[PDB]
């Protein structure tokens, strides 16, 4: 089997991407944030505290003839941005782009933190990291990809995120028309539950490539590119007037600037992030200070190849017995 679904930016900045997902019988379509940095499929629901729902579409398990309470199971998750959610668990039929999993754990939110409530466009998350990170207790549950894997034509999914435009998540096949050149594959460590890999270095603009190992995670659920402070300083030093602002929470730059590209290495291959992809717009409405799309990871504990990096590439998440990641230009 295969599936193919379009993923769409939630706003003009590509702050996140939503993909429609069918849950239950008859189908209830919710727009979920596919997140290769976590491993829970959770949704706003008829059980979510009413004051914490503000425009989201909800899953109502009592209206699904295939929903079953997973008795005794609860979940609770905290994300790197400080947001969180928790609740109980149903199993139900879940389909993405024509690919159907029966018995998928659908985690129904009873509580969500304010950043989720405030984002009316995101109806939940669909985790695509390794199932060892799933938070369901006392019986940990598998991700949608883990449940589908054995049925797929090939045990892979691909992320093809657009810049200010829709893109595609494919399951079970590699669309050879969706990228240019060849795909370069690189090793993955699953020891932390992430799609964790080591970039071979970077360049700023037309500058020379610096060969240096940068361990980090391919995370579709993080907006920006978080890298070591040395690398980030070298980037922003090429932008007149750019500076790190403690009050704003990272590097800002004059909105009048033209930003240089940023290149990262994948083995001997190179992925170029155009400068425009690094512009996240005014820090507040009408400001001439703009927020940078490359930020330091120094406070995180891990480097994160988020959407800013991933959208410059066609990315293969290879879930074979030994997982690997593939990157191609596009």
Describe this structure in words.
- This protein is mostly beta strands and 330 residues long.
- The chain has 2 domains: 5-174, Cathepsin D, subunit A, domain 1 (Beta Barrel); 175-330, Beta Barrel (Cathepsin D, subunit A, domain 1).
- It has 4 helices and 24 strands.
- A 7-stranded mixed β-sheet has the order 18-17-12-13-22-14-21. Strands 2-3-8-4-7-6 form a 6-stranded mixed β-barrel. A 4-stranded antiparallel β-sheet has the order 15-16-20-19, with no helix packed on it.
- The chain is globular and about 60 Å long.
- The relative contact order is 0.16.
Task: Label this structure with key terms.
disulfide bond, 6-stranded mixed β-barrel, 330 residues, protease, Cathepsin D, subunit A, domain 1, 7-stranded mixed β-sheet, 24 strands, Endothiapepsin, mainly beta, 4 helices, signal, EC 3.4.23.22
């Amino acid at each position: 089997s295969t599936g193919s679904a379009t993923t769409t930016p939630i706003d003009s900045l590509d702050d996140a991407y939503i993909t429609p997902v069918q849950i239950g019988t008859p189908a209830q379509t919710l727009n979920l944030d596919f997140d290769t940095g976590s491993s829970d499929l959770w949704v706003f629901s008829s059980e979510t505290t009413a004051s914490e729902v503000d425009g989201q579409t909800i899953y109502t398990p009592s209206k699904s003839t295939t929903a079953k309470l997973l008795s005794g199971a609860t979940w609770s998750i905290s994300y790197g941005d400080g947001s969180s959610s928790s609740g109980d668990v149903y199993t139900d039929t879940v389909s993405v782009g024509g690919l159907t999993v029966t018995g998928q754990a659908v985690e129904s939110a009873k509580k969500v933190s304010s950043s989720f409530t405030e984002d009316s466009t995101i109806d939940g998350l669909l985790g695509l990291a390794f199932s060892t990170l799933n938070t369901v207790s006392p019986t940990q549950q598998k991700t949608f990809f883990d449940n589908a894997k054995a049925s797929l034509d090939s045990p892979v999914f691909t992320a093809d995120l657009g810049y200010h435009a829709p893109g595609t998540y494919n399951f079970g096949f590699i669309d050879t028309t969706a990228y240019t050149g060849s795909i370069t594959y690189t090793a993955v460590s699953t020891k932390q539950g992430f799609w964790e890999w080591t970039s071979t270095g970077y360049a700023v603009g037309s500058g020379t490539f610096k060969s240096t190992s940068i361990d980090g995670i391919a995370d579709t659920g993080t907006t920006l590119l978080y890298l070591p402070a040395t690398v980030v300083s070298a980037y922003w030093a090429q932008v007149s007037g750019a500076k790190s602002s403690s009050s704003v929470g990272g590097y800002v730059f004059p909105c009048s600037a033209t930003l240089p590209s940023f290149t990262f290495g994948v083995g001997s291959a190179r992925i170029v992030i155009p400068g425009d992809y690094i512009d996240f717009g005014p820090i507040s409405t009408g400001s001439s200070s703009c927020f940078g799309g490359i930020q330091s990871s120094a406070g995180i504990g891990i480097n994160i190849f988020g959407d800013v990096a991933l959208k410059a590439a066609f990315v293969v998440f290879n879930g074979a017995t030994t997982p690997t990641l593939g990157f191609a230009s596009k």
